[PDB]
Design a binder for this molecule. Structure first.
Ligand SMILES: CCCCCCCC/C=C/CCCCCCCC(=O)O[C@H](COC(=O)CCCCCCCCCCCCCCCCC)COP(=O)(O)OC[C@@H](O)CO
Ligand SMILES: CCCCCCCC/C=C/CCCCCCCC(=O)O[C@H](COC(=O)CCCCCCCCCCCCCCCCC)COP(=O)(O)OC[C@@H](O)CO
Ligand SMILES: CCCCCCCC/C=C/CCCCCCCC(=O)O[C@H](COC(=O)CCCCCCCCCCCCCCCCC)COP(=O)(O)OC[C@@H](O)CO
Ligand SMILES: CCCCCCCC/C=C\CCCCCCCC(=O)O[C@H](COC(=O)CCCCCCCCCCCCCCCCC)COP(=O)(O)OC[C@@H](O)CO
Ligand SMILES: CC(C)CCC[C@@H](C)[C@H]1CC[C@H]2[C@@H]3CC=C4C[C@@H](O)CC[C@]4(C)[C@H]3CC[C@]12C
Ligand SMILES: CC(C)CCC[C@@H](C)[C@H]1CC[C@H]2[C@@H]3CC=C4C[C@@H](O)CC[C@]4(C)[C@H]3CC[C@]12C
Ligand SMILES: CC(C)CCC[C@@H](C)[C@H]1CC[C@H]2[C@@H]3CC=C4C[C@@H](O)CC[C@]4(C)[C@H]3CC[C@]12C
Ligand SMILES: CC(C)CCC[C@@H](C)[C@H]1CC[C@H]2[C@@H]3CC=C4C[C@@H](O)CC[C@]4(C)[C@H]3CC[C@]12C
Ligand SMILES: CC(C)CCC[C@@H](C)[C@H]1CC[C@H]2[C@@H]3CC=C4C[C@@H](O)CC[C@]4(C)[C@H]3CC[C@]12C
Ligand SMILES: CC(C)CCC[C@@H](C)[C@H]1CC[C@H]2[C@@H]3CC=C4C[C@@H](O)CC[C@]4(C)[C@H]3CC[C@]12C
Ligand SMILES: CC(C)CCC[C@@H](C)[C@H]1CC[C@H]2[C@@H]3CC=C4C[C@@H](O)CC[C@]4(C)[C@H]3CC[C@]12C
Ligand SMILES: CC(C)CCC[C@@H](C)[C@H]1CC[C@H]2[C@@H]3CC=C4C[C@@H](O)CC[C@]4(C)[C@H]3CC[C@]12C
Ligand SMILES: CC(C)CCC[C@@H](C)[C@H]1CC[C@H]2[C@@H]3CC=C4C[C@@H](O)CC[C@]4(C)[C@H]3CC[C@]12C
Ligand SMILES: CC(C)CCC[C@@H](C)[C@H]1CC[C@H]2[C@@H]3CC=C4C[C@@H](O)CC[C@]4(C)[C@H]3CC[C@]12C
Ligand SMILES: CC(C)CCC[C@@H](C)[C@H]1CC[C@H]2[C@@H]3CC=C4C[C@@H](O)CC[C@]4(C)[C@H]3CC[C@]12C
Lengths: 222, 57, 317, 338, 298
C-alpha cells in the first residue's frame, strides 16, 4: 500500500494546483462581447487589445479582462448560451450609422436587427442578473448622416429634430426601453468613435460598479 | 439544384428500409428476450452485496 | 496597643447605624425623566421609520435590522439612566440588586449599541474593498447578529463572574484614623455608606478594558471605511464621535461617582446627562441622514451616489 | 421545376407512414404486460468526486469501468479513480469552453471539444509522463457537441454545423462527412459492433449512419423538440433519445419506427443525458429539475430517483460491467451510485 | 462622640509607633536589569543604524528624524522601568520625588514614542490620496515636530499640574474600623505604608483619558492608511499592535499595583516586564522592516 500512498499524495498535489489556479481564475473579469457584424466589434476589440470563438485578454488598473467574441458562431445560439451564464457583464455593440441602413439577407433596418438581438439577450433567462454595457459606435459618421437623412426613415413615430445629440439620446432610451428587468440589471450606455476616447476606462468603471453591486446584493443591502 | 441529393437519399432509404421490415412484435420479442437473458448479471437490476461491491469495500 | 480595647469599646455603641432616605431634588428627577422619556420617544420614532421604510433602497443600504438592534441597546441604556434615580429607600437586598441591575443593563446596552455599528462598518469595508469578479462577499444579518451575540455573551460572562464571585456589599463602616508625616501627626474620623464591592477597580478595569479594545477596533474600522461611501451609508463619523464621547463620559462619570458620593444630585444629574448625551448623539448620527435622503429616493433610482471609493498607488516623494 | 419532386416527396412520406403501421401490428406496451416489474430501484451515493469548480458538462467511463474522465468549463479535464477518488490527471485545456469529452477504449487517449470548433486528442501514456495534446482536429464550422472513439486511430465527432465527421487522428483529415441533418447534431452513440452509429440533431430527427461508406441508413422522427441525448441499446438494435419536451423515446433499427415512449405529465424539464444499464432493462436519464430518473425500459414507469445534485444534471454514465452510474451536474460534483 | 475619647487616647498611645521596610530579591533585580539593558542596547543600535544610514532610500521613506524621536522616547521608558526597581531613599523624602519622576518619565516617554508614528501616518494620509491637482508637500518634518511638541506641551502641563497642585506624599496611617452589615458586626485591624496621593484616581483618569483620545485618533489614522503602502512606510500595524498592548499593559499594571502592594517582587516584575514588552514590540515593529530592505538593497 505504498504506491497507494504515493497516488494519494499525487492526488493531494493535484487538488492543491486546482485550488491555486481556481482562486487565480476567480480574479479575472469575463466579458461576453455581442453585437451584429461590421457594427464595430472588431474596432472595439482593437482598442481593448491595444489598451470558432475568439477570446481576447487585456489588463487595466490591475483588473484582468477576458473578452469572448462569439460572432463567428453560425449555429443555434440557444444551445450554447447557457454557457457564459457566469460572465460578469455583457458588451453589446451597435452601429448608430445603421439607422438608415437596411440589411443584406430588406425592409429590415440593420438597426431593428440590433434591437431584436438586444431584446433577446437582455431578457434571456440565463442573464436575468447580468448587467449590459451598451456601446454605440460611429458617432461622427452618424452625426454626419443625420444632417440630410431624417431619423424618421428608421422611426416613423419619432418627433424630434434631425440633430444628433437629440437623436442619439432618443436611440439610447429606445434601447433601454427594451430592458424589462430594470429592478435586477442595469445598462451602461456609452457613445464611442473610431478613436479610443475612453472605452477601456468606461468598461473598467462599469465592471467595478457591477462587482460592488453584486457584493451588495449578496449581503442583501441592494 | 443542390437539393438533388435528397431524392436519392430517400430512395436509398426506401429500398434499404423495406428490404426488411420485421414486425414490431418480433422486435419487442427479441428486446424482452435480451433483457431477460442478461438479467441477474446487471448490478443495477438487483443490488450487488457489499462483499463483491468495489464501491464500499 | 489600646486600639483593640477601643475596638470593643465602640462595639457597644455600634448596635445601631444610620439608615437611608431620598434626597434627590424632585425638579432634577422631573427634568431628567422628561429628557429620558423624550429620548425614548425619539427611539420609538426612529424604529417606526426604519420598519415602515425597510424596503426603501437607502434604508435597505443602511442595514435596518442592525439599526433595530442598536435601538434596543439604546432603550436599555435609557432605562438604566432611569434607574440611576432610584436611590430611594427600597431595602438593602434590593439596593445591592438595584445597583448591580442598572450597571449590567448599562454594560449590555453599550454592547448592543456599539456591536451593530461595528458589524455594519466591517461588512461595508469587505463589500467595497474586496472586488473579486467570481468570489463575492456573502455576509448576512445572521452573521452580524452572531458577532453581536458573541460580544453580548462575553459581557454577560464578565458580569456573571462579577456578581457571583464578588457582589456589591453595601456596608456600614465607622472608622477613625490618625495619619502621621515625617514631622507632623493628625487624626480624623469618618462614616461612609457606600455601595461598592471589594476589588471594585478590578471589575471596572476589566469591563472598561474590553470596552476599550472594542472601541479601538471600532476606530480602526471607521478609519478603514474613511471615504468608502456617503454619510448615509459610510457611518465612520458616527463611530468616531461615539468613541470619543464614550471615552469622555466614562472618565468623567467614573471620577464624579468616586469623588462626589456626598453630592447625590450632581452625581445623578451628570450620570443621566452623560448617558443621555452619548446615546442620543449616536442615534441621531445613525438616523438623521436616512431621514434626509429618504424623500429624494422615491422618484426614480438614478441618483445613486454611495458608490465612491479611494484607491491609488502613486510613488512617494 | 420543383412541383413534381415536391409531390413525389409527399407521396414518398405517405408511403413511409402507411408502411410504418404495415409492420406496426402491435406496440411494446402489451407484449410486456405479462412481465413482472422490477420494483422500486434503490441507489446510494457511494462516492462524491470533488475538485471541479465550474459547471460539469461531460463525463465518460473508461472501458476498465474504474477510471473516469470529466470535463468542466473551468478549463480542467480530470481523470478519477472511482474506487479511491484520487485524481489521476488534471489536464489544462487551451479553450475552457469544453462541452464534450471522450475516453479511448484502449485508455491511452482522451478527447475534448466545444465552442472552439476543435476536437483535441490528448495522449495519456506519454514517456515524459505528463499529458500533451496529440492532435487538434480542425475542419468543423460549428461548435463540437460530442465525440467518440472507434479506436486509437478513428474518432467520430458531431458539430453544430449539422454535420458529423469521421476522422483519422494521425493524418488529421476528415475521412468521411455526414450530411442530411438540418440541425446542430447534439449527440452521438456508437453501436457495440462499431459499424453504425446514431446522431441526434436539433431538427427533432435522429439518423443512423454507416461509418464504412458514409450514407444515412434510416431517419427516425417522433420528437417535438431538439434531441439532446442518444444512446444505443446494449444489443445494438435499438436506441433511446432525450429531448427538450421531457420525453424519452425508443426506436428499433429493423422495425424502423417508434417502439415506446417514456414520459410523465408532472415532468416538464428537458432531458440532458440518457444511458441504458448493462442488461438494457433500466433507462436512466438526466433532467433539468436537478434529479435523475431511472425508467423501466419495458414498463415506462419511474423506478428510482437520484436526487443528489442541487443544479442541472448534465451527464450520465454506466460502467461497462454495470457496477456503477456516475452523475455529473452543474454544481461541480460527480456522484457514483450503486 | 464615644469614639472621640477613644481616638484621643489612641493618639496619645502612639509611642511614635514604628516603621517597616521592603526589599526586592537580588535575583529578580538581576534578570530585570539584564533584560532592560539589552533592550536599551537594541535601542542604541537602532539609532546608530538610523543615523549611519540616514542617506539610504528606505531610511528616507521611513522619516528618520521622527524615528529618532521615537527612539529617545523608548530610552525614556526604559530608564523609567529601571527606576521602578529602586526602593531605598536617598534624602529620605526622595521616595516621593523618585516615584513622581518615575511616572513623569513614563508618561513623557509614552507620548514621545507614540507621537512621531501618528505624525508619519497623518502626513502619509495627506499626500497619499487627498490629492487634488494641487500638491501637498507642505508637510515637512518641522510641522510634525511641531505636533509632537504640542503633545509634549499638553502632557507636561498635565504633569506640572499634578506635581504642583496635589503631589505624591508618602504617609503612614494606622486605623481601626467597625463594619456593620445589616445583621452582623465584624472587626479588623490595619497597618499600611503606601506611597500615593489623594485624588490619585483623578490624575490617572485624566492622563489616561488624554492618552486614550490620542490612541483613538491613532487607530483612526491607522485605518485611514491601512492600504496605502508597505510596513516600512505604512506603520498601520505598528499603531494597532502598539495601542492594543498599551491598553492591556496599562490596565494590568494599574490593577496589580493597586491590589498587590504586598507583593513587591511581583509588582516590580510585572511592571518592568510590561514596559519592556510594549517598548520593545513597538520599536521592533517600527524598525526591523527597515532593516530587512536595508540589508536587501544596501
Ligand atoms: C461627557 C458628555 C456628557 C456630560 C454630562 C452631560 C451634561 C448634562 C448635565 C447635568 C447638569 C446638571 C447636574 C446637576 C445640577 C444641579 C446640581 C447642583 O449643583 O445643585 C445641587 C442641588 O441643586 C438642586 O436643588 C437641583 C435643582 C435643579 C438645578 C439644576 C437645573 C436642572 C438641570 C438642567 C440641565 C439638564 C440636566 C438633566 C439631565 C437630562 C439629560 C441631559 C447640589 O448638589 P448636591 O448633590 O445636593 O450636594 C451638595 C453638597 O455640597 C452637600 O449636599
Ligand atoms: C510605548 C511605551 C509604553 C510604555 C508603558 C507601557 C504601559 C503603560 C503603563 C504603565 C503604568 C504602570 C504605572 C503604575 C500606575 C501608578 C501607580 C502608583 O505609582 O501609585 C498611584 C498614585 O496615584 C498617582 O497619583 C499617580 C497617577 C498620576 C500619574 C499617571 C501616570 C503617568 C503615565 C502613566 C502611563 C502612561 C500611559 C498610560 C496608558 C494609557 C493607555 C489608555 C496609585 O496609587 P495606589 O497604589 O492605587 O493607591 C491609592 C489609594 O490606595 C490611596 O489613595
Ligand atoms: C502586555 C504585557 C503585559 C505584562 C506582561 C509582562 C510580564 C512578564 C513577567 C513577570 C515575571 C513573573 C513575576 C516575577 C516574579 C514574581 C513571581 C513570584 O510570585 O515570586 C515572587 C518573589 O519570588 C522571587 O523572588 C524569585 C526571583 C525570580 C523568580 C522568577 C523571576 C525569573 C524570571 C522572570 C521573568 C523575567 C522577569 C522580567 C522579564 C522582562 C524584564 C524587562 C513572590 O512575590 P513576593 O512579593 O516576593 O511575596 C510576598 C508575599 O508572599 C507576601 O509579602
Ligand atoms: C450606548 C451609547 C453610550 C452609552 C453611554 C454610557 C455611559 C457610561 C458612563 C458612566 C458609567 C456609570 C457610572 C457608574 C459606574 C460604577 C460606579 C458605582 O456606582 O459603583 C462603584 C462600585 O462598583 C463596583 O464595585 C463594580 C463596578 C462595576 C463596573 C462594571 C459596570 C458595567 C459597565 C459599565 C460601563 C457601561 C458603559 C461602558 C463604556 C466604557 C467606556 C470606556 C463605586 O465605586 P467607589 O465608590 O469609588 O468605591 C469605593 C471604594 O472604597 C471601594 O470600592
Ligand atoms: C479572560 C479571563 C481569563 C479573565 C479572568 C479574570 C479573573 C481571573 C479575575 C477577575 C475576578 C477576580 C476574582 C475576584 C474575586 C476573588 C475572590 C477572592 O476571595 C479571591 C480572588 C478572586 C477569586 C479573584 C481571582 C481573579 C479573578 C477571578
Ligand atoms: C484606546 C482608548 C479608547 C482607551 C481604551 C478605553 C478604556 C479601556 C480606557 C479609557 C479610559 C481608561 C480609564 C480611565 C480611568 C480609570 C480610573 C482608574 O482608577 C482605573 C482605570 C480606569 C477605569 C481606566 C481604565 C482604562 C480606560 C477605561
Ligand atoms: C476638552 C476638549 C479639548 C475636548 C475636545 C475633544 C475633541 C478634540 C474630540 C471630540 C470629537 C472629536 C472629533 C469627532 C469627529 C471628527 C471628524 C473626523 O473626520 C476627524 C476627527 C474628528 C475631528 C474628531 C477630532 C477629535 C474630536 C474633535
Ligand atoms: C472634561 C471635563 C468635564 C473634566 C472634568 C473633570 C473634573 C470633574 C474632575 C477633575 C478634578 C476633580 C475634582 C478634584 C478635587 C475635588 C475636591 C473634593 O473635595 C471634591 C471632589 C473634587 C471637586 C473633584 C471633582 C471632580 C473633578 C473636578
Ligand atoms: C461641559 C460643562 C457642563 C462641564 C462642567 C463641569 C463642572 C460641572 C465640574 C468641573 C469642575 C467641578 C467643580 C470643582 C470644584 C468644586 C468645588 C467644591 O467645593 C464643590 C464641587 C465643585 C463645584 C465641582 C462641581 C462640578 C464641576 C464644576
Ligand atoms: C442642553 C439641552 C438643550 C440639550 C442639547 C442637546 C444638543 C446639544 C444635542 C442633542 C441632539 C444633537 C443634534 C442632533 C442633530 C443635529 C443636526 C446635524 O447637524 C447633526 C448634529 C446635530 C446639530 C446635533 C448636535 C448636538 C445636539 C443638538
Ligand atoms: C481642556 C481643559 C478644559 C481641561 C481642564 C481640566 C481641569 C478642569 C481639571 C484638571 C485639574 C483639575 C483640578 C485639580 C485640583 C483641584 C483642586 C481641588 O481643591 C478642587 C478641584 C480642582 C480645582 C480640579 C478641578 C478640575 C481640574 C482643574
Ligand atoms: C485574552 C484575550 C481575549 C486577548 C485577545 C487580544 C486580541 C483581541 C488582540 C491581540 C492582538 C490584536 C490583533 C493584532 C493584529 C490585528 C490585525 C489588524 O489588521 C486588525 C487588528 C488585529 C486583529 C488585532 C485585533 C485585537 C487583537 C487580536
Ligand atoms: C483584563 C485586565 C485589564 C485586568 C488583568 C487581570 C488582573 C487585574 C486580575 C487577574 C487576577 C486578579 C487577582 C486574583 C487574586 C487576587 C488575590 C486577592 O487577595 C487580591 C486581588 C487579586 C490580586 C486579584 C487582582 C486582580 C487580578 C490581578
Ligand atoms: C504571560 C504570563 C506570564 C502572565 C502570568 C500572570 C499571572 C502570574 C498573574 C495573573 C493572575 C495572578 C494570580 C491571581 C490570583 C492569585 C491568588 C492569590 O492567592 C495569590 C496571587 C495569585 C496567584 C496571582 C499571582 C499572579 C497571577 C497568577
Ligand atoms: C522570557 C521570554 C519568553 C520573552 C520572549 C519575548 C519575545 C516573545 C518577544 C520580544 C521581542 C518580540 C518580537 C519583536 C519583533 C518581532 C518581529 C515581527 O515581525 C513579529 C513579532 C516579533 C517576532 C516579536 C515577537 C515577540 C517577541 C519575540
Amino acid at each position: 500500500s505504498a504506491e497507494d500512498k504515493a497516488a494519494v499524495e499525487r492526488s493531494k498535489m493535484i487538488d492543491r494546483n486546482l485550488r491555486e489556479d481556481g482562486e487565480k481564475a476567480a480574479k479575472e473579469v469575463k466579458l461576453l462581447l455581442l453585437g451584429a457584424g461590421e457594427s464595430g466589434k472588431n474596432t472595439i476589440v482593437k482598442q481593448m487589445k491595444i489598451i470558432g470563438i475568439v477570446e481576447t485578454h487585456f489588463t487595466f488598473k490591475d483588473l484582468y479582462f477576458k473578452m469572448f467574441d462569439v460572432g463567428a458562431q453560425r449555429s443555434e445560439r440557444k444551445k450554447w448560451i447557457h454557457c457564459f451564464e457566469g460572465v460578469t457583464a455583457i458588451i453589446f455593440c451597435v452601429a448608430l450609422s445603421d439607422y438608415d441602413l437596411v440589411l443584406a439577407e430588406e425592409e429590415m433596418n440593420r438597426m431593428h436587427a440590433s434591437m431584436k438581438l438586444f431584446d433577446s439577450i437582455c431578457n434571456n433567462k440565463w442573464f436575468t442578473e447580468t448587467s449590459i454595457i451598451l456601446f454605440l459606435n460611429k458617432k461622427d459618421l452618424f452625426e454626419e448622416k443625420i444632417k440630410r437623412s431624417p431619423l424618421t426613415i428608421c422611426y416613423p413615430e419619432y418627433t424630434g429634430s434631425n440633430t444628433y445629440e437629440e437623436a442619439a439620446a432618443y436611440i439610447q432610451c429606445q434601447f433601454e426601453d427594451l430592458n424589462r428587468r430594470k429592478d435586477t440589471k442595469e445598462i451602461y450606455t456609452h457613445f464611442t468613435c473610431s478613436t479610443d476616447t475612453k472605452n477601456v476606462q468606461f468598461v473598467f468603471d462599469a465592471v467595478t460598479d457591477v462587482i460592488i453591486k453584486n457584493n451588495l446584493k449578496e449581503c442583501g443591502l441592494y | 439544384a443542390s437539393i438533388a441529393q435528397a431524392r436519392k437519399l430517400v430512395e436509398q432509404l426506401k429500398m434499404e428500409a423495406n428490404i426488411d421490415r420485421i414486425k414490431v412484435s418480433k422486435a419487442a420479442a427479441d428486446l424482452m428476450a435480451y433483457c431477460e437473458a442478461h438479467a441477474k448479471e446487471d448490478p443495477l437490476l438487483t443490488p450487488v452485496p457489499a462483499s463483491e461491491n468495489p464501491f464500499r469495500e | 496597643r489600646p486600639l483593640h480595647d477601643l475596638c470593643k469599646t465602640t462595639i457597644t455603641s455600634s448596635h445601631h447605624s444610620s439608615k437611608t432616605i431620598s434626597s434627590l431634588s424632585p425638579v432634577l428627577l422631573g427634568i431628567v425623566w422628561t429628557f429620558l422619556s423624550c429620548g425614548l420617544l425619539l427611539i420609538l420614532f426612529f424604529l417606526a421609520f426604519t420598519i415602515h421604510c425597510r424596503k426603501n433602497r437607502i434604508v435597505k443600504m443602511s442595514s435596518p435590522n442592525l439599526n433595530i438592534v442598536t435601538l434596543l441597546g439604546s432603550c436599555l441604556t435609557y432605562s438604566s439612566a432611569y434607574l440611576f434615580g432610584i436611590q430611594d429607600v427600597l431595602v438593602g437586598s434590593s439596593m445591592e440588586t438595584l445597583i448591580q441591575t442598572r450597571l449590567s443593563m448599562l454594560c449590555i446596552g453599550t454592547s448592543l449599541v456599539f456591536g451593530p455599528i461595528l458589524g455594519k462598518s466591517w461588512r461595508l469595508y469587505k463589500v467595497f474593498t474586496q472586488r473579486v469578479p467570481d468570489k463575492r462577499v456573502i455576509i448576512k444579518d445572521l452573521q452580524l447578529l452572531g458577532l453581536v451575540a458573541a460580544l453580548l455573551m462575553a459581557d454577560v460572562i464578565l458580569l456573571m463572574t462579577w456578581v457571583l464571585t464578588d457582589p456589591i456589599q453595601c456596608l456600614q463602616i465607622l472608622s477613625v484614623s490618625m495619619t502621621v508625616t515625617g514631622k507632623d501627626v493628625s487624626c480624623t474620623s469618618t462614616s461612609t455608606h457606600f455601595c461598592a464591592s471589594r476589588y471594585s477597580d478590578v471589575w471596572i478595569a476589566l469591563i472598561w478594558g474590553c470596552k476599550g479594545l472594542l472601541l479601538l477596533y471600532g476606530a480602526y474600522l471607521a478609519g478603514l471605511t474613511g471615504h468608502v461611501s456617503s454619510p448615509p451609508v459610510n457611518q465612520s463619523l458616527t463611530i468616531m464621535v461615539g468613541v470619543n464621547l464614550l471615552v469622555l463620559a466614562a472618565g468623567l462619570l467614573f471620577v464624579v461617582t468616586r469623588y462626589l458620593h456626598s453630592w447625590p444630585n450632581l452625581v445623578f444629574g451628570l450620570t443621566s446627562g452623560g448617558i443621555f448625551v452619548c446615546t442620543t448623539t449616536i442615534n441621531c448620527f445613525i438616523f438623521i441622514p436616512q431621514l434626509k435622503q429618504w424623500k429624494a429616493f422615491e422618484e426614480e433610482n438614478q441618483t445613486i451616489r454611495r458608490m465612491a471609493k479611494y484607491f491609488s498607488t502613486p510613488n512617494k516623494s | 421545376e420543383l412541383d413534381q419532386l415536391r409531390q413525389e416527396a409527399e407521396q414518398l412520406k405517405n408511403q413511409i407512414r402507411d408502411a410504418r403501421k404495415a409492420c406496426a401490428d402491435a406496440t411494446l406496451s402489451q407484449i410486456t404486460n405479462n412481465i413482472d416489474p422490477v420494483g422500486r430501484i434503490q441507489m446510494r451515493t457511494r462516492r462524491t468526486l470533488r475538485g471541479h469548480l465550474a459547471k460539469i458538462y461531460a463525463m465518460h467511463w473508461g472501458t476498465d469501468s474504474r477510471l473516469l474522465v470529466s470535463a468542466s468549463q473551468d478549463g480542467k479535464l480530470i481523470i478519477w479513480d472511482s474506487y479511491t477518488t484520487n485524481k489521476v490527471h488534471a489536464i489544462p485545456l487551451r479553450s475552457s469552453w469544453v462541452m464534450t469529452c471522450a475516453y479511448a477504449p484502449s485508455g491511452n487517449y482522451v478527447a475534448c471539444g466545444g465552442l472552439d470548433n476543435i476536437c483535441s486528442i490528448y495522449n495519456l501514456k506519454t514517456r515524459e509522463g505528463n499529458v500533451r495534446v496529440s492532435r487538434e482536429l480542425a475542419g468543423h464550422t460549428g461548435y463540437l457537441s460530442c465525440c467518440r472513439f472507434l479506436d486509437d486511430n478513428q474518432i467520430v465527432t458531431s458539430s453544430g454545423d449539422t454535420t458529423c465527421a469521421l476522422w483519422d487522428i494521425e493524418t488529421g483529415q476528415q475521412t468521411t462527412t455526414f450530411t442530411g441533418h438540418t440541425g446542430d447534431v447534439m449527440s452521438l452513440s456508437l453501436a457495440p459492433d462499431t459499424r453504425l452509429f446514431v446522431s441526434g440533431a436539433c431538427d427533432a430527427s435522429a439518423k443512423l449512419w454507416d461509418v464504412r461508406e458514409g450514407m444515412c441508413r434510416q431517419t427516425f422522427t417522433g420528437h417535438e423538440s431538439d434531441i439532446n441525448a442518444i444512446c444505443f441499446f446494449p444489443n445494438g438494435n435499438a436506441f433511446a433519445t432525450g429531448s427538450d419536451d421531457a420525453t424519452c423515446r425508443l426506436f428499433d433499427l429493423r422495425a424502423d419506427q417508434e417502439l415506446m415512449t417514456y414520459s410523465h405529465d408532472n415532468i416538464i424539464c428537458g432531458i440532458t443525458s440518457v444511458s441504458f444499464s448493462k442488461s438494457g432493462r433500466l433507462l436512466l436519464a438526466g433532467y433539468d429539475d436537478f434529479n435523475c430518473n431511472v425508467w423501466d425500459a419495458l414498463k415506462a414507469d419511474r423506478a428510482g430517483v437520484l436526487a443528489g445534485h442541487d443544479n442541472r444534471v448534465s451527464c450520465l454514465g454506466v460502467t461497462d460491467d454495470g457496477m456503477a452510474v456516475a452523475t455529473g451536474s452543474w454544481d461541480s460534483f460527480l456522484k457514483i451510485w450503486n
